[PDB]
Structure 1
Amino acid sequence: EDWDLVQTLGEGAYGEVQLAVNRVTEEAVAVKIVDMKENIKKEICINKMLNHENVVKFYGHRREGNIQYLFLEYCSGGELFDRIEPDIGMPEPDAQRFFHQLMAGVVYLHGIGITHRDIKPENLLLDERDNLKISDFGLATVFRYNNRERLLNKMCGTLPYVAPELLKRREFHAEPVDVWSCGIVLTAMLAGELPWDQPSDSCQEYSDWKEKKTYLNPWKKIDSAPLALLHKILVENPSARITIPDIKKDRWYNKPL
């Protein structure tokens, strides 16, 4: 149980992720390396609640002086982001499959009162069977406790995926915001492109979308069935926006491919 550090698998703010393999049992893991010179105690506290096949497995922590260590399931398939060919995307049947799994993961987190708050292709990893795994709970927080919803007010995430209500509202519900980001993801997957830099009335592309101008990119690359689902998800008003139970009833979602 001396995981030795075979190779860097990436970098970041915090620090890096190493491919730590055992040498006796040879069991691979991803290890997160975080120079504390928070946040870390919340991400662990959260990683400790999680158990699901579309959520990235948490194994342990190790304080070790100045550097925190997170032993997390290894995803040798890499990021969904690299399965998205620019300007093209991917085959509709692969996208549907990744959406299915993504929704199973999100349902699961929401079910236990947790919101991820930064859903994007970069944070969706793929194992060697290409199974989608939600990764990175550093922006993640509790929106439900003792069966009692708390609204959010900390603005965070990544702007091209963030829902309009969180740029414009003092406080807002957690669940629609993940719902929106999942639809920006789906768009990326079917088009190879992000529609806007941000969902704000000062962004031409976003104003073009609200005006149902879907003869522009990205939308013209998207077949009508998935596009009608995107019409229900990317609803500006978070109360009018589609919920996950209803996403699961939608025609494209249930289309055999």
Structure 2
Amino acid sequence: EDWDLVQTLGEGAYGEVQLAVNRVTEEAVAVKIVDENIKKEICINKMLNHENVVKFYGHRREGNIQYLFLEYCSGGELFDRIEPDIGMPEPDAQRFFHQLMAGVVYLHGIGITHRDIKPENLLLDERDNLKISDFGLATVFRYNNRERLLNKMCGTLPYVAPELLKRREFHAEPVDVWSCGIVLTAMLAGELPWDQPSDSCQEYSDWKEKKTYLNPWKKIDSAPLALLHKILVENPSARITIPDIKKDRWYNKPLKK
């Protein structure tokens, strides 16, 4: 390889992510090293071409270790921009949300669902532009203009939609929309609303009962909270769609710090 692995960026179950620099052109990229299927991940990654999605540059196989070359995001994880119990300035949150929607609209437009949207997977470039990363759980939900219902159990509990826990088969799109809503909640309140959207989760029941005087809802302004009321809807068929999110008042509110 003509790429030098200069530093450990991410160390976790995903294997490992390193910063790689080309000792010739001096370009920098991220490298995910392994060494839940590389084949599918690469195949999905090859379809991606959007400013709010981590770009795929290629892959290399050496021994029993696969190398995924990806767009480097020096800004790191959105997760690290969320102050515990506080969140972040509403204008920053709105801007990141706008960028998140653009990325998701793009993926759904090509028939791909991410299935694990959360702040740890939303990266920022040098200009603080958001990029969706980690397509290890991503899958095709539309092919030849024919939608396929999902049934596989996956994602991250605090971020997963309730239908994924109750229904045998569910539509892909509303699930990603729900997780985006949980991300929005985290950005505005610096805390997750519930451990999981189950009948047995007190915090979730409180939300369904509109007990918005409780955390984290009490920390959120009326405008963004009204958007969250439309996104965090238990019945996926009644849940707001992205086209309608784009028409939301808070979504379209001019904001500045």
TM-score normalised by L of structure 2? 0.98
Distance 1:20 1:159 in 2: 33
Match of 1:188 among 167, 186, 209: 186
1:225 to 214, 223, 226: 223
Q: TM-score, normalised by structure 1?
A: 0.98
* 3-state SS of paired residue (1:254): coil
Question: Which residue is equivalent to 1:252?
Answer: 250
CA distance in 2, matches of 1:220, 1:177: 25
Say which SS state the counterpart of residue 32 (structure 2) adopts: strand
RMSD: 0.7
SS in 2 for 1:130: coil
Return closer, same or farther for 1:77/1:104 CA change in 2, 3 Å cut-off. Answer: same
Q: Residues of 1 paired with 2:152 and 2:215: CA distance?
A: 32
Q: What are the Cα deviations for residues 48-106 of structure 1, in whole angstroms up to 9, with x where unaligned?
A: 00000000010000011200110000000000000000000000000000000000000
Bigger mean CA deviation after superposition, 207-216 or 18-27? 18-27
Percent identity for Structure 1 against Structure 2: 100
User: Post-superposition shift, 1:183?
Assistant: 0.2
Alpha-carbon distance between aligned partners in 2 of 1:171 and 1:244, rounded to the nearest angstrom: 21
Query: CA 1:31 to 1:224, structure 2 compared with 1: closer, same or farther past 3 Å?
Result: same
How far the C-alpha of 1:13 sits from its partner, in A, is 2.1
Q: For 1:125 and 1:14, how far apart are their aligned partners in 2?
A: 15
CA distance, structure 2, for counterparts of residue 70 and residue 252 of structure 1: 38
Q: Whole-Å Cα distance in 2 between the matches of residues 47 and 94 of structure 1?
A: 28
Stretch of structure 1 that moved more, 21-30 or 132-141: 21-30
The one-character-per-residue Cα deviations of 1:169-226 (angstroms, maximum 9, x if unpaired) are 1100000000000000000000000000000010000000000000000000000000
Alpha-carbon shift at residue 14 of structure 1 (Å): 4.1
- The residue correspondences of 1:1-257 to structure 2 (distance < 5 A) are 2-35=2-35, 39-257=37-255
Question: In structure 2, what is the Cα distance between the partners aligned to 1:89 and 1:119?
Answer: 18
CA distance, structure 1, for counterparts of residue 216 and residue 18 of structure 2: 36
Please give the secondary structure, in 2, of the residue aligned with 1:94: helix
Deviation at 1:109, TM superposition (A): 0.1
Q: How many Å apart are 1:11 and its aligned residue?
A: 1.1
